[PDB]
Amino acid sequence: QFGRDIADTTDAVRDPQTLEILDITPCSFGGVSVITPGTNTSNQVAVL
Amino acid sequence: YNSASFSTFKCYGVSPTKLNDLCFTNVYADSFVIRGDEVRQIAPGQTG
Amino acid sequence: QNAQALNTLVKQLSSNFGAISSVLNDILSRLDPPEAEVQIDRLITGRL
Ligand SMILES: *[C@@H]1O[C@H](CO)[C@@H](O)[C@H](O)[C@H]1NC(C)=O
């Protein structure tokens, strides 16, 4: 019916009504970070 | 679940509202006739 | 050591700790919130 990997991670699936092998990939994430000189110099800021 | 003409309708392990959206492998309907309120006597893990 | 360490972390995501299933979406989509409270309590304590 479906496939997986190391953890309880459904890494594929067989679709009803079309019988095709669909891969599943996580939607992107990742923590932002804020780089700044001191507020006593400027309020400009860059974001990584 | 809304035709409440029954006497007792108690679901264990499943909330009645969320029954409309689950594809079960199979169901078993087991039926009998018993006198009195022996519904309390027949309880998962209980005695009687 | 480092690799092996976090490997156990991942394997910890497939352990019941006492709930009805190790996967969160099952509990969210099969139980009414007053009992999902209990199940999620167990899972959260374990992973913490
Ligand atoms: C659903 O209908 C299509 C054709 O209309 C068919 O290809 C498909 O096999 C059907 N689904 C199943 C489980 O048979």
Side-chain angles (χ1 to χ4, degrees), chain A residues 16-19:
Chain A
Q17 299 186 336
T18 189
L19 276 297

Side-chain angles (χ1 to χ4, degrees), chain C residues 10-47:
Chain C
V10 175
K11 301 312 209 287
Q12 286 295 317
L13 287 189
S14 49
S15 189
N16 277 325
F17 291 102
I20 71 168
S21 68
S22 161
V23 62
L24 209 43
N25 289 100
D26 183 9
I27 304 166
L28 276 296
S29 59
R30 201 205 291 156
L31 277 188
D32 189 72
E35 298 77 355
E37 212 164 90
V38 188
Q39 305 321 97
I40 297 171
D41 289 330
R42 304 231 191 101
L43 276 162
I44 287 177
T45 59
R47 305 189 176 172

Side-chain angles (χ1 to χ4, degrees), chain B residues 2-34 36 41-43:
Chain B
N2 298 327
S3 310
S5 68
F6 295 140
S7 301
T8 68
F9 181 39
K10 38 176 73 76
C11 289
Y12 292 166
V14 174
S15 70
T17 76
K18 316 219 188 197
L19 263 185
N20 303 110
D21 59 282
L22 274 163
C23 306
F24 300 82
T25 77
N26 55 5
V27 61
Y28 292 96
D30 308 340
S31 48
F32 49 90
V33 170
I34 192 167
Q41 267 69 26
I42 306 302

Side-chain angles (χ1 to χ4, degrees), chain A residues 23-36:
Chain A
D23 194 318
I24 287 177
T25 304
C27 288
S28 51
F29 61 82
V32 305
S33 171
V34 160
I35 179 169
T36 176

Side-chain angles (χ1 to χ4, degrees), chain A residues 2-28:
Chain A
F2 69 95
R4 55 179 40 172
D5 205 7
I6 303 308
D8 192 356
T9 61
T10 43
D11 204 350
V13 65
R14 156 179 313 286
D15 185 16
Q17 299 186 336
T18 189
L19 276 297
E20 182 65 26
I21 301 299
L22 299 173
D23 194 318
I24 287 177
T25 304
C27 288
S28 51

